[PDB]
């Protein structure tokens, strides 16, 4: 009855479909569990109608990102804005000391660079001589190079370098050291509407192709040579080809028994071992988001990128100065609670200087993300939690403490005072259709495995797509977009040839 | 009757000194170190100036501190005795344009950020690719500007290419003379400034029998007596015969060998002549001309925000319009042509503010070629030098919250007491600064021919004979350790039964 049945209406599946029509293939079905398209790409509205990409926001690797280039052409053709380069010089803030960026004495950015070169060398040509956690690596650097670091450097550098937790979505004691430093292939470009990207691709194919709210319960390719998909309601389908674009964490449920978990798909026969094994090489991180909407900017627009550093101590310097080796340092680093906004690094994007809107887009990581999303409905508790860092930022930006107007009450006094009006929070960790953010490595992992296995497919008519199925752009929106075009073209060439 | 020696080392630079240090360490005796000059050290020379202040007119920094073996030693000695031997003086660079003033970390130009994209762009252009034409660095920057003009503001397309050029001071070559493939390279760690590079030379020099050192003997010829004996002739007539010889003369000096006319200072006549593999490598590698000029002042009366300052060359608004209207590659290569002398603003200059880093009231400035050759050819005229550099000197002081300088060579303003200049392009024993690449060059050729040797007895060492640390002090040092270890390995066989 059907040529190709794409499961999932995320950018991956959507591009796939988009491509199939663009190639004259017809009778295709797009089955999506949610009541919307866009997958991990969702734009939401808040105060006064403002819009934000609570999911993906940036176009990365702009020098080689195909999707970006495409958006570039369009914009070059009709003078319509679609993005803005928001990269800037980072302002780093330590609760007690204030700004620590571009400091004439600390030179944190400079030693941070040495630190990364230190990493590269540690894992170069050695098969990766036993990989450890990002935290472990950082401790080695300090120990080995202590003779060439001041006290403050040993103290503040380790906290500053942790901004990388916001790229992976994992705490430095849970992140693989070997996969921490990536290749920054160019400047980043803030997408003024990833939804526009989603709608354009979405419209590009026959609308009667989309089937929202069709959670797929099980896939089975009868040796008869065709695939049989069954949604959760009962409606059955049969197709020549099928492209599973569900996220990795969800597909990881297929290997567990007692499959009843929302989203889980039952394959038959099961997934070949090369696939099941891939999951032991870990994966899935938890980057989260929190939006702070204000009445109107009343703070310095010096930079669009701000990072708050976790607290640090002087006893730490001393401990590093006295340790006689890694072992001693380890055990010595044993001090005996409760998490606060200064327990981990936090990344704020000042949307004022980059888009004009008086709002801060913040990024958080595991384990904090999971916790903050659990209390997303409790605005009060959310305010109390972030207030202390929200005030520190305003101070270092020539302003004053933040006023809680989430339960508005007009008052002139709030002339040039910052007034919070709304707070928005992601929920990717508690949404059974995503269960996290995107692929990520724990120490001892190897991403190549999944990429290969996925890209090989279960067999001939069963293929996979999405950010966890490709190398270039791994974990990214453009990575997924290309994995979708990958399966469509391959099948497109086959159909065109069969007759 | 010509004296017998086990090993004769020609040249007393850090390479040869280390070669000898190693021989003695491995127990070899009856050796010799012959040097043309009347001092040891070579391109590691420390001079004295106003009020007895000191400066390294040759090498100044230990590079790649994370792996630099020579740097690690000095670090061990300080760790066990508390004596200051070096200092980490890296910093936040201050960039200055004559018209616009400081353009570093400017919230709208964001120059450093696009420079990183530039380098990444270059990396994707070459790194790991096969059969890619080379072209000059200048051309690479023109290509980047073309392919990304849609994502660069007008003012960015103007100033970014001028900031890019700080690299000219690492290679000692102007951007149109520089190989683009060899322009970008990896920096393994921070740089540590030597507080007495001549202090490193002596330690190594005092680690072997002092009767070995023969200064002021220039070697005129080296001959292999087909019987495992090498003859060496000093100009003063002494004749020596030894089993092995480590030749460490500069690559620019050894090049003189592949030419007729032996009355040139430094030239060594080889018999038989250097194998064709060696003469031919001279066509695939060249020599740069980094240079220095020290400006000494009475006292510091300027800001010590940073110790690294770079002044950009003038840029125009027409360049922009051309970049915007450019059609393709050739169209730009064409349009770029107009119709004029050279001044201090005709090329980027790199100033080191010693007052912050060492506490001395002076600037150490680095220059590239062609400027270095012209500036060293007038080093004797201090008045002319002061004029030439006065405008940038003023601009700097202005930006560092001070005022125009006062020629005091012959109380709230900066007074210039003395100027010191390099002499490498003119000294017949240097003939330049160090090995560098021209577009289309292949340094690997020289290293291979060099480290392989003339034959089993006639060996080579020096900054141009090794891959890791090429052109650097630690590269020459290691190259010395290498040739000596090999010889030690071979004489060791004399004790077997
Ligand atoms: C907070 C956050 C920020 C991010 N920021 C960036 C960024 O700045 N830049 C960037 O490049 N990337 C970013 N990413 C990553 C990027 O969003 C993803 O790589 C990409 O969207 C994954 O695409 P996909 O098509 O594979 O899946 P889409 O979510 O991404 O999901 C696949 C589809 O499968 C559907 N599905 C699941 N189970 C079933 C079932 N049983 N039956 C039917 N359908 C099902 C889902 O509902 C979904 O629509 C971010 C991710 C997060 C979470
Ligand atoms: C301006 C300048 C700045 C520099 N800055 C740095 C820096 O910051 N960091 C760094 O790592 N490197 C730097 N270098 C490079 C470094 O100085 C060299 O790599 C290193 O000194 C080369 O050592 P060498 O032992 O091979 O030769 P030395 O010159 O370098 O030369 C070998 C010796 O041969 C002798 N000789 C020549 N001909 C004869 C002959 N016919 N008979 C007898 N003896 C002869 C010479 O007098 C000399 O002493 C710089 C170089 C210059 C010119
Ligand atoms: N400091 C901002 C980091 C943003 C990292 C986004 C990573 C997206 C990976 N798919
Ligand atoms: N800001 C430029 C610094 C350049 C230092 C060059 C050292 C070169 C040693 N061969």
* Domain annotation for chain A: domains and CATH numbers: 1-84+189-282+433-499 (3.50.50.60), 85-188+283-432 (3.90.660.10)
Strands A29-32 and A2-7: parallel
User: For residues B389 and A62, what is the distance between their CA atoms, to the nearest angstrom?
Assistant: 42
**Partners of B78 in the β-ladder:** none
> What is the distance in A from the centroid of ligand 1 to the CA of A234?
26
- Other CB atoms within 10 A of residue B271 CB: 10
User: For residues A458 and A45, what is the distance between their CA atoms, to the nearest angstrom?
Assistant: 40
Closest Cα partner for B433 from B289, B240, B311, B333?
Answer: B289
Indicate which residue's Cα is closest to atom 14 of ligand 1.
A56
User: For residues A28 and A22, what is the distance between their CA atoms, to the nearest angstrom?
Assistant: 12
For the CA of A166, the closest atom of ligand 3 is: 3
Burial of B323 (C-beta count, 10 Å sphere; 0-12/13-18/19+): buried
Alpha helices, H only, B426-472: 444-452
A242 ligand 1 Cβ < 6 A: no
State whether B305 and A63 contact (CB < 8 Å): no
The answer, yes or no, to whether the previous bond of A123 is cis (omega within 30 of 0) is no
Does residue B50 come out as left (phi exceeding 0), alpha (psi in the -120 to 50 range) or beta?
beta
Find the helix packing angle between B69-79 and B473-491, rounded to 10°: 90
- Please tell me whether residue A105 adopts helix, strand or coil conformation: coil
A433 ligand 1 Cβ < 6 A: yes
CB A170 within 8 A of CB A440: yes
Indicate which residue's Cα is closest to atom 33 of ligand 1.
A8
- Other CB atoms within 10 A of residue B236 CB: 10
First to last CA, chain B: 31
Q: What resolution (Å)?
A: 2.5
**Partners of A189 in the β-ladder:** A59
Q: Show the beta-strand stretches assigned E in B258-338.
A: 269-271, 286-288, 291-297, 308-311
Closest Cα partner for B177 from B373, B371, B425, B439?
Answer: B439
DSSP string, A117-150: HHHHHHHSSSS-SS--BHHHHHHHHHHHHGGG--
Alpha helices, H only, B246-381: 251-254, 276-281, 317-325, 329-335, 354-357, 371-376
Chain B residues within an 8 Å CB radius of A121: 66-67, 188
Q: Is B75's Cβ below 8 Å from some Cβ in A? A: yes
Which residues neighbour A360 within 8 Å (Cβ) at sequence distance 6 or greater?
A291, A292, A294, A348, A349, A350, A351, A393
- Other CB atoms within 10 A of residue A248 CB: 23
Please give the method by which this entry was determined.
X-ray
Closest Cα partner for A84 from A102, A66, A92, A72?
Answer: A72
State whether B107 and A302 contact (CB < 8 Å): yes
User: For residues B223 and B77, what is the distance between their CA atoms, to the nearest angstrom?
Assistant: 41
> What is the distance in A from the centroid of ligand 4 to the CA of B171?
8
> For a pocket test of ligand 3, which of A363, A469, A470, A473 has the largest count of ligand atoms closer than 8 A to its C-beta?
A363
- Other CB atoms within 10 A of residue B215 CB: 13
B290 ligand 2 Cβ < 6 A: yes
Chain B residues within an 8 Å CB radius of A111: 190
Q: Which candidate from B66, B75, B91 shows the least CB-CB separation from A121?
A: B66
CB B160 within 8 A of CB B49: no
User: For residues A7 and A22, what is the distance between their CA atoms, to the nearest angstrom?
Assistant: 19
Which residues neighbour B296 within 8 Å (Cβ) at sequence distance 6 or greater?
B49, B50, B53, B361, B362, B416, B417, B418, B419, B420
User: For residues B22 and A498, what is the distance between their CA atoms, to the nearest angstrom?
Assistant: 74
**Ligand showing the shortest atom-to-Cα distance for residue B433:** 2
Alpha helices, H only, A194-266: 194-203, 248-251
Indicate which residue's Cα is closest to atom 15 of ligand 1.
A476
Chain A residues within an 8 Å CB radius of B66: 114, 117-118, 121
């Amino acid at each position: 009855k059907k040529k190709v049945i794409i499961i999932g209406a995320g950018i991956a599946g959507l591009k796939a479909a988009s491509t199939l029509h663009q190639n004259g293939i017809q009778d295709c079905l797009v089955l999506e569990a949610r009541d919307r398209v866009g997958g991990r790409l969702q734009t939401v509205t808040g105060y006064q109608g403002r819009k934000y990409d609570i999911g993906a926001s940036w176009h990365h690797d702009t020098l080689t990102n195909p999707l970006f280039l495409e958006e570039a052409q369009l914009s070059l053709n009709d003078g319509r804005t679609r993005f803005v380069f928001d990269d800037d010089n980072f302002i780093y803030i330590d609760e007690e000391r204030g700004r620590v960026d571009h400091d004439k004495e600390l030179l944190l950015e400079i030693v941070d660079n040495e630190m990364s070169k230190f990493a590269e060398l540690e894992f170069h040509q050695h098969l990766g001589v036993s990989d450890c956690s990002f935290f472990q690596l950082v401790m080695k650097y300090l120990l080995q190079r202590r003779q060439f670091l001041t006290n403050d450097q040993i103290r503040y550098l380790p906290q500053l370098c942790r901004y990388l937790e916001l790229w992976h979505g994992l705490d430095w004691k849970l992140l693989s050291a070997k996969d921490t430093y990536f290749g920054h292939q160019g400047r980043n470009a803030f997408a003024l509407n990833y939804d526009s990207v989603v709608q354009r691709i979405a419209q590009s194919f026959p609308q009667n192709w989309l089937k929202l709210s069709c959670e797929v319960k099980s896939i089975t390719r009868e040796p008869s040579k065709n695939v049989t998909v069954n949604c959760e309601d009962g409606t059955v389908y049969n197709a020549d080809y099928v492209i599973i674009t569900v996220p990795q964490s969800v597909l990881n449920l297929s290997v567990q028994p007692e499959k009843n978990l929302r989203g889980r798909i039952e394959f038959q026969p099961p997934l070949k071992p090369v696939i099941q094994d891939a999951f032991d090489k870990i994966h899935f991180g938890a980057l989260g988001k929190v939006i702070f909407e204000f009445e109107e900017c009343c703070w310095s627009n010096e930079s669009s990128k701000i990072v708050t550093l976790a607290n640090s101590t002087n006893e730490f310097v001393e401990i590093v100065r006295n340790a006689e080796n890694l072992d001693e340092l380890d055990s010595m680093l044993e001090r005996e609670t409760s998490v606060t906004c200064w327990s981990q690094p936090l990344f704020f994007v000042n949307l004022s200087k980059s888009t004009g809107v008086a709002s801060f887009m913040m990024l958080m990581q595991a384990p904090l993300t999971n916790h903050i999303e659990s209390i997303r409905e409790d605005k009060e508790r959310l305010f109390s939690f972030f207030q202390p860092v929200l005030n520190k930022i305003m101070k270092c930006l020539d302003s004053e403490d933040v006023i809680d107007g989430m339960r508005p009450i007009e008052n002139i006094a709030n002339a040039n005072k910052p007034v919070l009006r709304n707070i928005i929070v992601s929920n990717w960790t508690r949404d059974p259709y995503s269960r996290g953010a995107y692929s990520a490595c724990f120490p001892g992992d190897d991403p190549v495995d999944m990429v290969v296995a996925m890209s090989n497919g279960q067999d001939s008519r069963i293929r996979f797509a999405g950010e966890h199925t490709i190398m270039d752009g791994a974990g990214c929106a453009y990575g997924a977009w290309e994995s979708g075009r990958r399966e469509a073209t391959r099948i497109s060439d086959l159909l065109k040839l069969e007759h």
